Design a protein around this ligand. Sequence first.
Ligand SMILES: Cc1cc2nc3c(=O)[nH]c(=O)nc-3n(C[C@H](O)[C@H](O)[C@H](O)COP(=O)(O)OP(=O)(O)OC[C@H]3O[C@@H](n4cnc5c(N)ncnc54)[C@H](O)[C@@H]3O)c2cc1C
Ligand SMILES: Nc1ccccc1C(=O)C[C@H](N)C(=O)O
Length: 455
Amino acid sequence: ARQVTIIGAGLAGTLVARLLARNGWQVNLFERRPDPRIETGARGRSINLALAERGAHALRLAGLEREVLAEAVMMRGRMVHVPGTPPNLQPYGRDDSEVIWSINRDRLNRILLDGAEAAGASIHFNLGLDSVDFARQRLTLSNVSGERLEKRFHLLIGADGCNSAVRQAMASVVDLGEHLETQPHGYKELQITPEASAQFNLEPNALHIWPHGDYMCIALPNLDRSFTVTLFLHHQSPAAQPASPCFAQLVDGHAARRFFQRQFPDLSPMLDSLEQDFEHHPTGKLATLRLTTWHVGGQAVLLGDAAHPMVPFHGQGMNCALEDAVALAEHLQSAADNASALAAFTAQRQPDALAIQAMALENYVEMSSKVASPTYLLERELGQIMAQRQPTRFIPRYSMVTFSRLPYAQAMARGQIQEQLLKFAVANHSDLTSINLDAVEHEVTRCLPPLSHLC
Ligand SMILES: Cc1cc2nc3c(=O)[nH]c(=O)nc-3n(C[C@H](O)[C@H](O)[C@H](O)COP(=O)(O)OP(=O)(O)OC[C@H]3O[C@@H](n4cnc5c(N)ncnc54)[C@H](O)[C@@H]3O)c2cc1C
Ligand SMILES: Nc1ccccc1C(=O)C[C@H](N)C(=O)O
């Protein structure tokens, strides 16, 4: 049987472990953290994530989608909150098939671990990779105390996240050609209890947003009607707007409460544990990292966040990472040798990772605006008529990304054509009735070939 060692029993690494093990491979998976299925007296984990069609499809191929969705809350649309003003759903799509799902991250990881073991993978926890000797084909791991132990490997998969040690180790033998692009927002996890959720009548089946321009909060629902909230806020005030809010001014929980009472006056009273959460949850950093090189011959490959860290504003990191896992397993299963598989996987996935990294960055401005332009509104209206006239040609970029499996680069390219056609058609008009609709439709059929078999 073909042998593989995967570093990182997170979301992509556990999926790819199940796909390879079930297809005959002898799989060993090493994870730095303890096994989250071993119950302890520690506090419960509250991070959740949006699962969309790309990740759900990956799970479906793995036979795990039904299990994960039984523990997921449907989000039918965005619920945008701006003070005093009543929220109204902006639905994601036309019916409940076009929804995204809110799932507890720890639960998803526990379901994936059970899936990898059921397929025959061996998982070893409390061992973090420290280094790799590619010439000798040996790995060095240690527990939290740092005491080193070595393991031989044959094929190494780095599914070890944004600060991947496999990627770091690859720098010793290849030029990674890395481009690290910092992003100025940090983030902080907060919580709305089930009682406050109900008191303030927050719709459970929606993604909630409190836009505020250069900062914003989002909230995703849990099965118990609590919401996990994330504040995105600059670490530091930029040189030009030097008094503007940032994490550096929020020196403690009390300061954070004042900031929320001033800037998010409607959300603040929903957040009972703000002061505590602010002080005990560390502030997270965001970044986009692009790498020229994702593999070393047939010996080692990166996927998921180890290959392509991205900013979180599209909710697609996990979805892309599970899509990567499926592609990697497909290439490894059927290729002439591991070197061929890994080069082909990389060539396939790199243009798509670049496109979703860019679209993620672009998604911030959308989400964080308190008010949409009249121009933007009219473009959206016209787009809705086009989608109705030509649903296999005009499919909004958001939907191509979230509700289909169209390669991300293609979704980006078609989104660009759509953006230009709407922009030119709406210019110098203030309403639909002044727009030549057939002429727009003619540009749609001229410029956008039909796609079948999308949903
Ligand atoms: C604030 C925020 C919100 C997000 N929201 C969404 C969302 O709504 N939807 C979505 O699709 N994505 C979202 N993401 C992105 C998602 O969290 C990641 O893209 C996804 O977890 C990547 O999966 P992965 O398997 O590559 O990495 P991970 O799931 O991070 O797993 C790597 C695993 O590596 C283990 N490990 C790390 N280093 C070592 C080592 N040296 N040795 C052994 N093990 C190691 C880590 O402990 C771990 O278990 C969000 C990200 C952030 C930061
Ligand atoms: N779901 C998320 C979870 C966390 C961070 C962002 C998102 C998103 O906003 C993606 C979704 N389609 C959205 O754009 O509304």
